[PDB]
Design an enzyme around this catalytic site. Structure first.
Site, PDB file in Angstrom:
ATOM      1  N   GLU A   1       0.815  -1.219   0.000  1.00 20.93           N
ATOM      2  CA  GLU A   1       0.000   0.000   0.000  1.00 20.93           C
ATOM      3  C   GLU A   1       0.854   1.278   0.000  1.00 20.93           C
ATOM      4  O   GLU A   1       0.526   2.248  -0.699  1.00 20.93           O
ATOM      5  CB  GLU A   1      -0.985   0.005   1.175  1.00 20.93           C
ATOM      6  CG  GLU A   1      -2.043   1.101   1.096  1.00 20.93           C
ATOM      7  CD  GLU A   1      -3.309   0.657   0.385  1.00 20.93           C
ATOM      8  OE1 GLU A   1      -4.064  -0.162   0.969  1.00 20.93           O
ATOM      9  OE2 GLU A   1      -3.556   1.141  -0.746  1.00 20.93           O
TER      10      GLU A   1
ATOM     11  N   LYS B   1       7.096   0.145  -2.544  1.00 18.65           N
ATOM     12  CA  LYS B   1       7.186  -0.498  -3.852  1.00 18.65           C
ATOM     13  C   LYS B   1       8.608  -0.954  -4.125  1.00 18.65           C
ATOM     14  O   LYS B   1       9.551  -0.316  -3.676  1.00 18.65           O
ATOM     15  CB  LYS B   1       6.753   0.528  -4.903  1.00 18.65           C
ATOM     16  CG  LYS B   1       6.578   0.000  -6.303  1.00 18.65           C
ATOM     17  CD  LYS B   1       5.599   0.859  -7.090  1.00 18.65           C
ATOM     18  CE  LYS B   1       6.301   1.750  -8.098  1.00 18.65           C
ATOM     19  NZ  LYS B   1       5.360   2.136  -9.201  1.00 18.65           N
TER      20      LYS B   1
ATOM     21  N   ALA C   1      17.470 -10.185  -7.111  1.00 14.72           N
ATOM     22  CA  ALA C   1      17.406 -11.642  -6.964  1.00 14.72           C
ATOM     23  C   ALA C   1      16.499 -12.228  -8.044  1.00 14.72           C
ATOM     24  O   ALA C   1      15.275 -12.061  -8.009  1.00 14.72           O
ATOM     25  CB  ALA C   1      16.927 -12.031  -5.567  1.00 14.72           C
TER      26      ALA C   1
ATOM     27  N   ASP D   1      12.196 -10.189  11.714  1.00 16.41           N
ATOM     28  CA  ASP D   1      11.140 -10.500  10.738  1.00 16.41           C
ATOM     29  C   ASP D   1      11.489 -11.653   9.780  1.00 16.41           C
ATOM     30  O   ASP D   1      11.196 -11.594   8.581  1.00 16.41           O
ATOM     31  CB  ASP D   1      10.762  -9.239   9.953  1.00 16.41           C
ATOM     32  CG  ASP D   1       9.333  -9.287   9.377  1.00 16.41           C
ATOM     33  OD1 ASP D   1       8.554 -10.257   9.602  1.00 16.41           O
ATOM     34  OD2 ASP D   1       8.995  -8.318   8.674  1.00 16.41           O
TER      35      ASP D   1
ATOM     36  N   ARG E   1       8.799 -15.159   3.060  1.00 18.08           N
ATOM     37  CA  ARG E   1       8.555 -14.005   2.179  1.00 18.08           C
ATOM     38  C   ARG E   1       9.701 -12.986   2.254  1.00 18.08           C
ATOM     39  O   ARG E   1       9.794 -12.093   1.418  1.00 18.08           O
ATOM     40  CB  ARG E   1       7.220 -13.339   2.513  1.00 18.08           C
ATOM     41  CG  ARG E   1       7.225 -12.758   3.911  1.00 18.08           C
ATOM     42  CD  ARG E   1       5.941 -12.100   4.389  1.00 18.08           C
ATOM     43  NE  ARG E   1       6.232 -11.619   5.735  1.00 18.08           N
ATOM     44  CZ  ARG E   1       6.032 -12.316   6.857  1.00 18.08           C
ATOM     45  NH1 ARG E   1       5.464 -13.528   6.826  1.00 18.08           N
ATOM     46  NH2 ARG E   1       6.387 -11.780   8.020  1.00 18.08           N
ATOM     47  N   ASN E   2      10.585 -13.128   3.238  1.00 14.75           N
ATOM     48  CA  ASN E   2      11.703 -12.186   3.400  1.00 14.75           C
ATOM     49  C   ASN E   2      13.044 -12.798   3.062  1.00 14.75           C
ATOM     50  O   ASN E   2      14.087 -12.250   3.401  1.00 14.75           O
ATOM     51  CB  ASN E   2      11.736 -11.600   4.815  1.00 14.75           C
ATOM     52  CG  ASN E   2      10.557 -10.698   5.093  1.00 14.75           C
ATOM     53  OD1 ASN E   2       9.949 -10.154   4.165  1.00 14.75           O
ATOM     54  ND2 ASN E   2      10.240 -10.507   6.369  1.00 14.75           N
TER      55      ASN E   2
ATOM     56  N   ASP F   1      14.905  -7.538   3.873  1.00 16.72           N
ATOM     57  CA  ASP F   1      13.966  -6.786   4.714  1.00 16.72           C
ATOM     58  C   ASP F   1      14.483  -6.556   6.142  1.00 16.72           C
ATOM     59  O   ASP F   1      14.037  -7.200   7.098  1.00 16.72           O
ATOM     60  CB  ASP F   1      12.577  -7.433   4.705  1.00 16.72           C
ATOM     61  CG  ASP F   1      11.514  -6.562   5.376  1.00 16.72           C
ATOM     62  OD1 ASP F   1      11.760  -5.341   5.578  1.00 16.72           O
ATOM     63  OD2 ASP F   1      10.423  -7.096   5.694  1.00 16.72           O
TER      64      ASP F   1
HETATM   65  C1  LIG Z   1       9.201   0.664   4.135  1.00 16.85           C
HETATM   66  O1  LIG Z   1       9.662   0.618   2.766  1.00 16.85           O
HETATM   67  C2  LIG Z   1       9.074  -0.300   1.942  1.00 16.85           C
HETATM   68  C3  LIG Z   1       8.065  -1.138   2.401  1.00 16.85           C
HETATM   69  C4  LIG Z   1       7.480  -2.055   1.544  1.00 16.85           C
HETATM   70  C5  LIG Z   1       7.904  -2.165   0.219  1.00 16.85           C
HETATM   71  C6  LIG Z   1       7.250  -3.197  -0.732  1.00 16.85           C
HETATM   72  N1  LIG Z   1       6.579  -4.295   0.013  1.00 16.85           N
HETATM   73  C7  LIG Z   1       5.926  -5.393  -0.751  1.00 16.85           C
HETATM   74  C8  LIG Z   1       6.216  -6.245   0.477  1.00 16.85           C
HETATM   75  C9  LIG Z   1       7.414  -5.298   0.711  1.00 16.85           C
HETATM   76  C10 LIG Z   1       8.619  -5.761  -0.126  1.00 16.85           C
HETATM   77  N2  LIG Z   1       8.192  -6.210  -1.483  1.00 16.85           N
HETATM   78  C11 LIG Z   1       9.089  -6.777  -2.318  1.00 16.85           C
HETATM   79  C12 LIG Z   1       8.794  -6.893  -3.665  1.00 16.85           C
HETATM   80  C13 LIG Z   1       9.728  -7.450  -4.533  1.00 16.85           C
HETATM   81  C14 LIG Z   1      10.992  -7.882  -4.114  1.00 16.85           C
HETATM   82  C15 LIG Z   1      11.863  -8.471  -5.076  1.00 16.85           C
HETATM   83  C16 LIG Z   1      11.213  -9.297  -5.996  1.00 16.85           C
HETATM   84  C17 LIG Z   1      11.899  -9.957  -7.008  1.00 16.85           C
HETATM   85  O2  LIG Z   1      11.195 -10.723  -7.861  1.00 16.85           O
HETATM   86  C18 LIG Z   1      11.864 -11.106  -9.070  1.00 16.85           C
HETATM   87  C19 LIG Z   1      10.851 -11.823  -9.954  1.00 16.85           C
HETATM   88  C20 LIG Z   1      10.301 -13.066  -9.250  1.00 16.85           C
HETATM   89  C21 LIG Z   1      11.517 -12.203 -11.288  1.00 16.85           C
HETATM   90  O3  LIG Z   1       9.775 -10.925 -10.203  1.00 16.85           O
HETATM   91  C22 LIG Z   1      13.275  -9.817  -7.115  1.00 16.85           C
HETATM   92  N3  LIG Z   1      13.866  -8.975  -6.171  1.00 16.85           N
HETATM   93  N4  LIG Z   1      15.180  -8.708  -6.138  1.00 16.85           N
HETATM   94  C23 LIG Z   1      15.375  -7.892  -5.108  1.00 16.85           C
HETATM   95  C24 LIG Z   1      14.193  -7.657  -4.537  1.00 16.85           C
HETATM   96  C25 LIG Z   1      14.094  -6.792  -3.407  1.00 16.85           C
HETATM   97  N5  LIG Z   1      14.015  -6.038  -2.431  1.00 16.85           N
HETATM   98  C26 LIG Z   1      13.215  -8.322  -5.185  1.00 16.85           C
HETATM   99  C27 LIG Z   1      11.269  -7.792  -2.737  1.00 16.85           C
HETATM  100  N6  LIG Z   1      10.297  -7.213  -1.861  1.00 16.85           N
HETATM  101  C28 LIG Z   1       6.792  -5.921  -1.921  1.00 16.85           C
HETATM  102  C29 LIG Z   1       8.913  -1.318  -0.243  1.00 16.85           C
HETATM  103  N7  LIG Z   1       9.477  -0.382   0.649  1.00 16.85           N
END
Ligand SMILES: COc1ccc(CN2[C@@H]3C[C@H]2CN(c2ccc(-c4cc(OCC(C)(C)O)cn5ncc(C#N)c45)cn2)C3)cn1
Ligand SMILES: COc1ccc(CN2[C@@H]3C[C@H]2CN(c2ccc(-c4cc(OCC(C)(C)O)cn5ncc(C#N)c45)cn2)C3)cn1
Lengths: 291, 288
Positions: A35, A38, A108, A162, A166-167, A180
């Site tokens: 929400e 990103k 990743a 955490d 998922r992390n 994370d």
């Molecule tokens: C407080 O600051 C925040 C908080 C939340 C967020 C975004 N949130 C939602 C849950 C949390 C973290 N989220 C993600 C989404 C994608 C990835 C991620 C996803 C990903 O997927 C690759 C693929 C499967 C080919 O799509 C690859 N990589 N490589 C590095 C990262 C990182 N960091 C990733 C990691 N976390 C999505 C960002 N900043």
């Protein structure tokens, strides 16, 4: 207040080592979205003295971000600066001088371990209904890499808080990366999901390396069920009392005696009775040589 | 838990999702023999998702505890809760038009729209009336020694007959002693709706609710626009301190803009109280 100080420190040119020129960053597709935050894929030109374009992930806030979001992101940046390990996500730097604050981290290629696992099947240029096949050997391998990363963090006197499937991120060659660090701290209402939290964290708000170990046990369970949902059909609000009275998750299918025993020990009520991460790595190393 | 509010789980039927975010969800529902009404009543149910943290649990419980004590024509009605044989379910009033933000944004593409008789037909008079209903609810809330803390168009619900209902009490706090609420750690209210002293000093008073109300006002007269358009949340610290405030939007009168600006005074003493906000809106309405 504490945040306006960090914000202001961050927006000054004090860390030339970690500042990346914004013009050298080209943002691509969305890797994940919540929400208020990103993650997008990106290419970065001349990142850390590297030739050409390096593929990276960029973490950033969305417009309705609260001070707790800003805090998490800045706090992750400050933790990732002090950290260097093959099984911990790598920080490349940050853009703090041109518009929104961006954290630049290692990309990743397989994304989160949870996603990776649910697309896999358990076994003993064509095409298959699943993305890949995994053996118990792979799963033990994955758990060991995380335990290594965690041993390093505990040695650095850092509590992750955490830990969950998922992390964990899955990089090229299926290498596990702990990610994370928004809620990590150097060793009141917590923002860690109840189902991964140690009993003393739930009841006393206490977080230590041994509470990381409890979380590690839930992650193990997630790994052997190939991305299962912990305590299924049990409301998070009911969990306190089930745990207090000594209930734990039963032994899952396709899980061996030795594997399950390790999980259970992670979920001992007294933190002293739980294994340390060195003990955990040892157990996994033993399982491995013994096929 | 509480005899007067506990509701029989078997008398409650859950339907479709009306909204969900990070670890929480609202569903449309129906409740049999609710507070002794014959038959079924259509209601909404707030509950946790599987990955809930103690913060979300504590927020749902705190909203329940607040809604128990407050009763006002412009505050969302609590009917009860299922808190015993399983998941905690909060049973609240169903608002047929949904959030004020959603309703106003819809009026941009749904006729008759904004006209400057029908539920979808909006004049500035209707908008002033919405603002006034909210301000009366806030006035009562302030009298009940509460700070809502999260006043925004997304947290106002629009019910039958286009009545405004202040909702989302998860973050609201008691201020009986000191007339302020302060916490050591960071808040969970979006930066763009936060008062300057909430931002820098972690202080929440009725006068920081007034600041938020000004932002809400801006949301109303832009028909659900996004505050500080295109400005990163992080930039709000330096920008508010240096004295920048949002510009006067297009269908906003001088008096209406003067009210917003007053809500955004750096010195919290200089901001109007909710009672005086209501008087200003009453006068605006009758001079048309
Ligand atoms: C407080 O600051 C925040 C908080 C939340 C967020 C975004 N949130 C939602 C849950 C949390 C973290 N989220 C993600 C989404 C994608 C990835 C991620 C996803 C990903 O997927 C690759 C693929 C499967 C080919 O799509 C690859 N990589 N490589 C590095 C990262 C990182 N960091 C990733 C990691 N976390 C999505 C960002 N900043
Ligand atoms: C911590 O506990 C929590 C926290 C958050 C949440 C849910 N979150 C996301 C953002 C916040 C509150 N959310 C909603 C979702 C739907 C509604 C809602 C939406 C709605 O929409 C009607 C319509 C537009 C015709 O579908 C009508 N009503 N009536 C009462 C309520 C309530 N409550 C609603 C209100 N808030 C969704 C649940 N439990």
């Amino acid at each position: 207040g504490p945040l306006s100080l960090s914000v202001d420190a961050f927006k000054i040119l004090e860390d030339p080592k970690w500042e990346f020129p914004r013009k050298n960053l080209v943002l691509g597709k969305t890797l994940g979205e919540g929400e208020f935050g990103k993650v997008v894929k990106a290419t970065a030109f001349h990142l850390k003295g590297r030739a050409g374009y390096t593929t990276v992930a960029v973490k950033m806030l969305k417009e309705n971000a609260s001070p707790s979001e800003l805090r998490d992101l800045l706090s992750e940046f400050n933790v990732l600066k002090q950290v260097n390990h093959p099984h911990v996500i790598k920080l490349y730097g940050a853009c703090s001088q041109d518009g929104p604050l961006l954290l630049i981290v290692e990309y990743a290629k397989y994304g989160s371990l949870r996603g990776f696992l649910r697309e896999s099947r358990k076994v003993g240029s064509l095409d298959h209904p699943d993305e890949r096949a995994l053996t118990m050997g792979d799963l033990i391998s994955f758990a060991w890499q995380i335990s290594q990363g965690m041993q390093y963090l505990a040695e650095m006197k850092l509590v992750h808080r955490d830990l969950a499937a998922r992390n964990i991120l899955v990089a090229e060659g299926r290498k596990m990366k702990i990610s994370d660090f928004g809620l990590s701290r150097d060793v009141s209402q917590g923002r860690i999901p109840v189902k991964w939290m140690a009993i003393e964290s739930l009841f006393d708000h206490i977080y230590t390396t041994q509470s990381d170990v409890w979380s590690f046990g839930v992650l193990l369970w997630e790994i052997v069920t190939l991305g299962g949902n912990p305590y299924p059909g049990i409301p998070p609000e009911r969990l306190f009392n089930l745990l207090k009275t000594g209930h734990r998750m039963e032994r899952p299918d396709n899980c061996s005696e030795e594997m399950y025993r390790l999980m259970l020990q992670c979920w001992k009520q007294e933190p002293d009775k739980r294994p340390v991460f060195a003990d955990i790595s040892k157990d996994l190393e033993k399982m491995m040589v013994k096929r």
